[PDB]
Design a protein around this nucleic acid. Sequence first.
RNA 1: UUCAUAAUAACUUUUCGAAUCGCAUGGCCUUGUGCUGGCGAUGGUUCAUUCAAAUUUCUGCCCUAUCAACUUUCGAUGGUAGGAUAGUGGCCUACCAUGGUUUCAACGGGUAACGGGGAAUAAGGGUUCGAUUCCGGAGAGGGAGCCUGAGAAACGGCUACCACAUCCAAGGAAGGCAGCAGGCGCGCAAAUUACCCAAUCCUAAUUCAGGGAGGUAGUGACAAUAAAUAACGAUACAGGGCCCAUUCGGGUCUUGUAAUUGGAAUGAGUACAAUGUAAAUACCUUAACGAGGAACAACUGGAGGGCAAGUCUGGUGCCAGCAGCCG
RNA 2: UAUCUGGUUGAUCCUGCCAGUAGUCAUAUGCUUGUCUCAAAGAUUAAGCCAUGCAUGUCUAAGUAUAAGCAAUUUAUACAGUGAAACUGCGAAUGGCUCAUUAAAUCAGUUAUCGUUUAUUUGAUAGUUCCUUUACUACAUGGAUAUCUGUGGUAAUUCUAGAG
Lengths: 182, 134, 260
Amino acid sequence: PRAPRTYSKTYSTPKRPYESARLDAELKLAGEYGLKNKREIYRISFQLSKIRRAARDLLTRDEKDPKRLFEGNALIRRLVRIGVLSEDKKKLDYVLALKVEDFLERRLQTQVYKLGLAKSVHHARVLISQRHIAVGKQIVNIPSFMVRLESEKHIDFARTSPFGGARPGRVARKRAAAAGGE
Amino acid sequence: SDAITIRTRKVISNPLLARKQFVVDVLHPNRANVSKDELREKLAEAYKAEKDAVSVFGFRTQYGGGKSTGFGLVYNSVADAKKFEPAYRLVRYGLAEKVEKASRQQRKQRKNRGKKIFGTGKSIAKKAARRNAD
Amino acid sequence: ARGPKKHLKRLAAPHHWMLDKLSGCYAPRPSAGPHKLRESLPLIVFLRNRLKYALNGREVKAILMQRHVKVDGKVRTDTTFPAGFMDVITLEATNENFRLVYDVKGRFAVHRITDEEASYKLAKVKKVQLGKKGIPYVVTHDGRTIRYPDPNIKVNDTVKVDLATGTITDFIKFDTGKLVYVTGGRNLGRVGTIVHRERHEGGFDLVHIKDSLENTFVTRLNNVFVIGEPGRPWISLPKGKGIKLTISEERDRRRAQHGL
RNA sequence: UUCAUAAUAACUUUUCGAAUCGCAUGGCCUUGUGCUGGCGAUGGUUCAUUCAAAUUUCUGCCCUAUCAACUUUCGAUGGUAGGAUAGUGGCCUACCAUGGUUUCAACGGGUAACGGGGAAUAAGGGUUCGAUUCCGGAGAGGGAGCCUGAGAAACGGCUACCACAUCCAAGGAAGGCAGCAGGCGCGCAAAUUACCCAAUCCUAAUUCAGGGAGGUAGUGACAAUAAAUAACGAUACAGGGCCCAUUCGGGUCUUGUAAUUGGAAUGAGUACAAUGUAAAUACCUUAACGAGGAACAACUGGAGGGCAAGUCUGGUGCCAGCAGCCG
RNA sequence: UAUCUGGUUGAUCCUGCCAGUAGUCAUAUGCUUGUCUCAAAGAUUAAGCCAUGCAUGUCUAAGUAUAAGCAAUUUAUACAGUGAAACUGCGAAUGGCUCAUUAAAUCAGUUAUCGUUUAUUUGAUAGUUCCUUUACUACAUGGAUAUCUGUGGUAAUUCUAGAG
Ligand SMILES: [Mg+2]
Ligand SMILES: [Mg+2]
Ligand SMILES: [Mg+2]
Ligand SMILES: [Mg+2]
Ligand SMILES: [Mg+2]
Ligand SMILES: [Mg+2]
Ligand SMILES: [Mg+2]
Ligand SMILES: [Mg+2]
Ligand SMILES: [Mg+2]
Ligand SMILES: [Mg+2]
Ligand SMILES: [Mg+2]
Ligand SMILES: [Mg+2]
Ligand SMILES: [Mg+2]
Ligand SMILES: [Mg+2]
Ligand SMILES: [Mg+2]
Ligand SMILES: [Mg+2]
Ligand SMILES: [Mg+2]
Ligand SMILES: [Mg+2]
Ligand SMILES: [Mg+2]
Ligand SMILES: [Mg+2]
Ligand SMILES: [Mg+2]
Ligand SMILES: [Mg+2]
Ligand SMILES: [Mg+2]
Ligand SMILES: [Mg+2]
Ligand SMILES: [Mg+2]
Ligand SMILES: [Mg+2]
Ligand SMILES: [Mg+2]
Ligand SMILES: [Mg+2]
Ligand SMILES: [Mg+2]
Ligand SMILES: [Mg+2]
Ligand SMILES: [Mg+2]
Ligand SMILES: [Mg+2]
Ligand SMILES: [Mg+2]
């Protein structure tokens, strides 16, 4: 018998499964950011809910209370480091005002789309999935990645990738070989 | 443009084992892993030591290729490496030989068979032979 | 269980050895020795984990066998020796000397300490009795039985064993206004001065302790170890001197002292 | 404290107080095998310390009154002395007292009840579960009994009975998987007679030996994490912001639909290697291959309402069937 | 992570339940199933029964060596090297598995042992063993005993009787 390491769920399906307005909003968010499933929105909503439970619990506590100070400013510094909470509103009362779209916006998918190296959101998704974008010389094949403020300046195609400068790849190499042979 | 470059981080001397421990950080673009023997040689002429008193293991080429990381040790003498390292590393490096061991199941079978007999089996063998003689 | 227990599962090990909950089913059970296993520290843990001089069990065994470890001036070639609080670990290679004192987080921190003072050790008096033929003797916390002590040495006191002959060199009398260390509970590693010692007729003496930062707490007397006079500790206190900075103060220390 | 300890008188079918091993074998000269002499290893009485072990104080347990009185001649409550205990103790015996618990639920019955740390669930209060990764307890087919030891009422230790069985030359002998594998049975319900001491440790005279403890692999859609199944052009069929509105209409500005059509990228797979590992898989990296219907083809349920999506086509006609409910 | 909806009626407002809904480190099962990490897993009924194979033996320079075992060479007149077997010593009472019994029982928190045993580990610890000392082995006291050499018995078992 060895000590277990704790697996844990990271999403929560909603209570009403067939809400028309909610379903349309979920499809809008999936199509805006190229989300594969609707489990992605559930995961972001669950992260927002955990952050929000912490925020409300800290709000309930009295002002100028060591728990309030320590954990509140820890949460704010973590969120501004992520980039979802702007530096203007580091107050722990605007932290309740974050929306799911805010965390959606900081995904490596949307960041690659913003930088312009991917001209389409689905293009960003595939380019990430093909091991092309590297966040600071480290290839990331993972669309979400929660890109942080301090490292967004270091997104570019990887050196091993043809875009960053390397051998082209299977299709182009085979066509070059065929052209050289004939 | 191969230029396999090597680094030894967190190096600590240790005359308790007459060794020098470090983590091997090897940067190698446009190339696969570093084929331990070659990097053992690299550390050998890096630290002014023979290729026998140098050991590397626990390597891990990080995600996306390029950098790789392992653990490495440099012993003061080849004899100390012989007398302090595990047998399997001495087998990997060719400085020792795999011991001719029977498999575990057969060893346990023979252990029980020896259990069956009290004392040496020299007497019982001839006793049984002359027993089935008549 | 019918008889003694000789296995210590990894999760059941004290959270001050603070091993990895993975990479192993069991933990080093300290053999019988000078210290309680809940309070002690096995040599394998001190070398493989705290010092990283070794890598695993075989390396620790090879280190201990060739007589490079010297616990309180003695070799102690067994892997799970309970090297406890205030013991001295000497390695002639690297000529290094350690004294085990809790860092204020409450853990057996690596304390590199000088050779000159490493000649001696300090100890708490746990009993003062009269053995056969009328010979007085004193039992310390290590279990050391020192024969023929000073006639006015009492229980809960502290003493300075020379660790070479193993006799009585000097001692400090327990009383108010005296520098003191804590050896258990929430106040692990804390160092202060005894302000008051409420008697509590019937058991479980308590003492109030005020440290240099002028913070105050209270601890059981079993849990207390006089270490010297204020401003003049008899040993070399570890880094931080056990002030127990607040978590916010620790964060401020991380922010201020910071260079990369 | 009658404690530690000391002292006197005595007592013992008189315990211990080194007839034991390794290395180095120095110094004194009483120059001989003479005198002494270091570092250890095993022992060894007692007292401590540690690993503990036994008991032990207060409080806390699920349902049930279609269980209201329960216990004591056979210990039930207490007293004293003795026996036994390692030791307190009706723990047992001898003689006495007649006591102890109970509507604040005793006693009895049930538990498809091992207790707990905890799990699910979540406004707050709670409800249900907890056989199982840690701590305790109990058990080795059901029962009793015991040797050895410091520690067992041990069961991969013995003795006997009961139940179940095995080889048998019919005289006898040997049994204990609720250990790791695996088999029969049971049931809706649960894995390979695999590798190895690499890692965690543990045992021993003790590095070296051993360890189905354990780790590694095999099966594994129990659960849990991230996430492929296409992406972008150039063309034809179109739609919206339009310069106005001679009908136009360029499409002036963009967004889709077409078995048209191009160039790219990439794994899922194979596979030189090397890393990985005790040795191997597998993962990370990576040669060489590996996408056009990119057939490398995603299902599981549903389309009256609850509840997102058809009053389209054919079939059957209160049949077949569907329907958690209304139908 | 403070939410409700369909159904009694010609129609309404209720009480009320049925049903819907979302879980579930709650399993079973059906249909599908490409990847990486991770991992439960004969508990529920049967603590029912088990073939077979393993799951505990251990030697350091340092208890015992005359294996008629190996090495016989640079270290060898008792012995030294290596070392089976056996005696000795120690563990086998740890670990692993299961939840059958058990409802002030276990267990949890908190106490007590001035009410006791404790191999081991660690620290200390003893002149007297003379008994009338003006006759003793202390430069070392005695006998067995395994291993082994040989004879058997039984159909067989970790069965062992006789002799040296
Ligand atoms: Mg056990
Ligand atoms: Mg007394
Ligand atoms: Mg009595
Ligand atoms: Mg039961
Ligand atoms: Mg349980
Ligand atoms: Mg329960
Ligand atoms: Mg059960
Ligand atoms: Mg248990
Ligand atoms: Mg038992
Ligand atoms: Mg059974
Ligand atoms: Mg014993
Ligand atoms: Mg039994
Ligand atoms: Mg068994
Ligand atoms: Mg057992
Ligand atoms: Mg037996
Ligand atoms: Mg089994
Ligand atoms: Mg197992
Ligand atoms: Mg199953
Ligand atoms: Mg499989
Ligand atoms: Mg497919
Ligand atoms: Mg369908
Ligand atoms: Mg249907
Ligand atoms: Mg239909
Ligand atoms: Mg609808
Ligand atoms: Mg409610
Ligand atoms: Mg009605
Ligand atoms: Mg109606
Ligand atoms: Mg319902
Ligand atoms: Mg792959
Ligand atoms: Mg079962
Ligand atoms: Mg033996
Ligand atoms: Mg030998
Ligand atoms: Mg009952």
